[PDB]
Design a binder for this molecule. Structure first.
Ligand SMILES: CC(C)NC[C@H](O)c1ccc(O)c(O)c1
Lengths: 60, 338, 221, 274
């Protein structure tokens, strides 16, 4: 009980001391990234049928 | 006196809540209002892997994006080859029960773990023998929920005793032990950098554990039910988490808050697995309603639906290349959707 | 050539998987989900870390009995793993009607066992599976009831101090907890430290359960 | 007259083929349905499908035209196929009954002995017995007799009737219907006693479920085989139109069998899916 509460308060004190950025900045960063790496995504944009390994592609 | 400790803990919690609230001056939905929709994403069951004589409980791909492990209660761990759908290895497990698996990146090892509380590590590439029990890690006191490979040598595991561990295979010792969860750890997730890893729980909370230092960096709450799955964002700064409340939530590490919540009135069953596309624009969540939903990442607007199973969708996975999406259900059939 | 070798490997692995699946289906599973102090040790002995598994043969039949009593975790998360067992063995101690839990203050161990039984029987995963109910330490319970009454753990009971009456009362109290009265059946059995017939009763119960399953499959019953 | 029976025969053959092909597809598609008994069910469905494919059409055409218009070779072919298919259906029924009895009376021995390989072996044995009792004795002309009327019917291409001798008639009868009937009666009476005992342990459902299965088969086939075994002793006793009517009534068992042996919830779900 005593040790449990001591560890809890120590963890909370260590957690409260962290730099937090406004949600706007994180949202903008995630948006920019998801925008930049959209072309390479196979599922989002239709991948060429030939390049699609599972449908029809040369295996060896 | 416990009273003073409880009071200072409550004061610190209120301080943290006020700080977070002050940080959240806007909403991701508002910032993503101008963004257009992605469009309907049609997916067909290209390949179907059959052979498991019982329900499937877990699976995992490899860096090759070709091989994929699977787990079944029958007691056989299969290593399918997605391209040709021809079994390449079938390992008979000592324990009939298995609740997870793991395919190390290098591809020179495989893991397994279930109610037996014995994380087994089998070797795949050998000289003459097909498969042998390379090691058996038994330090936990409860059932294992998920295991991941930091590298060929180290392996991090989460157990039902509310304690995560970082075993070293060669030495077979708990190099580090993370504790602090108030409930069972039902799933974890490594980050691309592999330096930090997030861990869910059954007490409706997630913790961002630091591997090297071995301390909890941040804690995220907001769920009304247990967390049954979790997965980082491909960028590595945020992570999505399902739950039993039929609600997925995308938390951020830097801001330390919940960016957005995916939830619809129709869906009522809980989530059992989640994952992100390569670019992370589509969050694929395998619900317990015999279906799988591909939610938009930045607009929380559903897009398409995958329904090809009879029973609940147990495990879901995606390849690093992001070409295919494997889904394993209790129907005893894995489906490589594309 | 390599593709042919791979296909041959796949065929061999499939044949091995089918053979092993048949071998497994031949076996009969059982779940020994009991309380902490339900004399489960005596049962596991007279029959022969983590989950214990006892594989024993009788009358040319293989029984795999699983014991998860050493789990001590949230059962709601892994109970569904046992959906399909041929039955569920539930051990209860008739000598723990006047005792309480060392953790709780005024909760009878019998009441905790009753709650666990109600939880495991009315679960959405065991709607069809049957339940065998072993009652242990019958002589100790007889002596205890000879010394103390039964109104301790039940404030209402119409009956005098006697072994048979109390036995039947506990039996009915345990039986009246299942709601699917028309889908499953409870096979009760009183046992002692030296019974020498427990395996036989388990065999009879399993035979009856399998017969009823086949019947309901063929729609006869 | 013929216009009335044409639609009847057409509907009969269509129902037969539809039911049988549906059952076969249902058992072949889903994996849960791929069980032991479902193998015998598939054998029966395939036999009934062959019936509806080859036998029923020719018989309908014959009865509406009144004479055989194909040829003596095709007449013998059709007769042999009819005999094979009828015997295969009835023997699949009897082996299904034997399987049910073995399983319910002693579950462990049946679970241990029975296997997919042995099921295939038994199905092959049944079909081989059918072939041996249908093709060979027919091809060898041993079914024919010396009655001048029989020879007259044989030489004429039109007459494709089933006039036969005593030996082959009685033999085919006892091997295809009567022994299976006795086996089914005994095994089902035992199963009924077992179900009654079981219910006594723990009220007329089993009685009805068994009465359907048995009485359908009986009322479908017994008349034809009775008249058949009677025709041997003295021909003038029973007319011929009645014989053909009983033959068609027996064929109707081919349509009735699937609905009777594929009524469980699993089959219902598999059918609703497709
Ligand atoms: C009308 C003829 C061609 N059908 C014969 C009938 O189907 C039959 C089948 C099996 C027999 O053993 C039999 O005597 C008679």
């Amino acid at each position: 009980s005593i040790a449990q509460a001591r560890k809890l308060v120590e963890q909370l004190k260590m957690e409260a001391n962290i730099d937090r950025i406004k949600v706007s900045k994180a949202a903008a960063d995630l948006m920019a990234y998801c925008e930049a790496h959209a072309k390479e995504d196979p599922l989002l944009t239709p991948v060429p049928a030939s390049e699609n390994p599972f449908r029809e592609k040369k295996f060896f | 006196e416990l009273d003073q400790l409880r009071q200072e803990a409550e004061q610190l919690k209120n301080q943290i809540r006020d700080a977070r609230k002050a940080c959240a001056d806007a909403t991701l939905s508002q910032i993503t209002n101008n963004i257009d929709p992605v469009g309907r994403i049609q997916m067909r069951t290209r390949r179907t892997l059959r052979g498991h004589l019982a329900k499937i409980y877990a699976m995992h791909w490899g860096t090759d994006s070709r091989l994929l492990v699977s787990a079944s209660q029958d007691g056989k761990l299969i290593i399918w080859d997605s391209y040709t759908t021809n079994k390449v290895h079938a390992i008979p497990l000592r324990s009939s029960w298995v609740m997870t698996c793991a395919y190390a990146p290098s591809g020179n090892y495989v893991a397994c773990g279930g109610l037996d509380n014995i994380c087994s590590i089998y070797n795949l590439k050998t000289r003459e023998g097909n498969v042998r029990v390379s090691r058996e890690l038994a330090g936990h006191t409860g059932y294992l929920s998920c295991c991941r490979f930091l590298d060929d040598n180290q392996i991090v595991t989460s157990s039902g005793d509310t304690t995560c561990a970082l075993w070293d295979i060669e030495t077979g010792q708990q190099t580090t032990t993370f504790t602090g969860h108030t409930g069972d750890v039902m799933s974890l997730s490594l980050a691309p950098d592999t330096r930090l890893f997030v861990s869910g729980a059954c007490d409706a909370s997630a913790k961002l554990w630091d591997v090297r230092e071995g301390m909890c960096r941040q804690t995220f709450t907001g769920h009304e039910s247990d967390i049954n799955a979790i997965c980082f964002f491909p960028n590595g700064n945020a992570f999505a988490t399902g739950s039993d409340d039929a609600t997925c939530r995308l938390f951020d590490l830097r801001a330390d808050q919940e960016l957005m919540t995916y939830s619809h009135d129709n869906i009522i069953c809980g989530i059992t697995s989640v994952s992100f596309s390569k670019s992370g624009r589509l969050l694929l969540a395998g619900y317990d309603d015999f279906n799988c939903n591909v939610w938009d990442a930045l607009k929380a607007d559903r897009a398409g639906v995958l329904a090809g199973h009879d029973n609940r969708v147990s495990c879901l996975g995606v390849t690093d290349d992001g070409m295919a999406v494997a889904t394993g259900s209790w129907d005893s059939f894995l489906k490589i959707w594309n | 050539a390599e593709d042919k070798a791979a296909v041959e490997r796949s065929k061999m692995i499939d044949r091995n998987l089918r053979e092993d699946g048949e071998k497994a289906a031949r076996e009969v599973k059982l779940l020994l989900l009991g309380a902490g102090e339900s004399g489960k040790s005596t049962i596991v002995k007279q029959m022969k870390t983590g989950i214990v598994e006892t594989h024993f043969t009788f009358k040319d039949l293989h029984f795999k009995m699983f014991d998860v009593g050493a789990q001590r975790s949230e059962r709601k998360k892994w109970i569904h793993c046992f959906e399909g067992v041929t039955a569920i063995i539930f051990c209860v101690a008739l000598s723990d009607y006047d005792l309480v839990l060392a953790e709780d203050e005024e909760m009878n161990r019998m009441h905790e066992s009753m709650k666990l039984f109600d939880s495991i029987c009315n679960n959405k995963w065991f709607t069809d599976t049957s339940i065998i109910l072993f009652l242990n330490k019958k002589d100790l319970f007889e002596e205890k009831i000879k010394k103390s009454p039964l109104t301790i753990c039940y404030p209402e009971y119409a009956g005098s101090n006697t072994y048979e009456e109390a036995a039947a009362y506990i039996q009915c109290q345990f039986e009246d907890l299942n709601k699917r009265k028309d889908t499953k059946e409870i096979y009760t059995h009183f046992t002692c430290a030296t019974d020498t017939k427990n395996v036989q009763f388990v065999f009879d119960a399993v035979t009856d359960v399998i017969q009823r399953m086949h019947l309901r499959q063929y729609e006869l019953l | 007259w013929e216009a009335g029976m044409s639609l009847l025969m057409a509907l009969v053959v269509l129902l037969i083929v539809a039911g049988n092909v549906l059952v076969i597809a249902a058992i072949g598609s889903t994996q849960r349905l791929q069980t032991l008994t479902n193998l015998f069910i598939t054998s029966l469905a395939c036999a009934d499908l062959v019936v509806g494919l080859l036998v029923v059409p020719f018989g309908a055409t014959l009865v509406v035209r009144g004479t055989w218009l194909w040829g003596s070779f095709l007449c013998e072919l059709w007769t042999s196929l009819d005999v094979l298919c009828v015997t295969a259906s009835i023997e699949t029924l009897c082996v299904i009954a034997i399987d049910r009895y073995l399983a319910i009376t002693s579950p462990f021995r049946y679970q241990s002995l029975m296997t997919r390989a042995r099921a295939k072996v038994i199905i092959c044995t049944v079909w081989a017995i059918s072939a041996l009792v249908s093709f060979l004795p027919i091809m060898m002309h041993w079914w024919r007799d010396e009655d001048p009327q029989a020879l007259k019917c044989y030489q004429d291409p039109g007459c494709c009737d089933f006039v036969t001798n005593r030996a082959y008639a009685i033999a085919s009868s006892i091997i295809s219907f009567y022994i299976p009937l006795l086996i089914m009666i005994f095994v089902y009476l035992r199963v009924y006693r077992e179900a009654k005992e079981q219910i006594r342990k723990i009220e007329h459902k089993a009685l009805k479920t068994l009465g359907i299965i048995m009485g359908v088969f009986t009322l479908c086939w017994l008349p034809f085989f009775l008249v058949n075994i009677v025709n041997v002793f003295n021909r003038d006793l029973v007319p011929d139109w009645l014989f053909v009517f009983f033959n068609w009534l027996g064929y109707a068992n081919s349509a009735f069998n699937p609905i009777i042996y594929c009524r469980s919830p699993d089959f219902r779900k598999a059918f609703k899916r497709l």
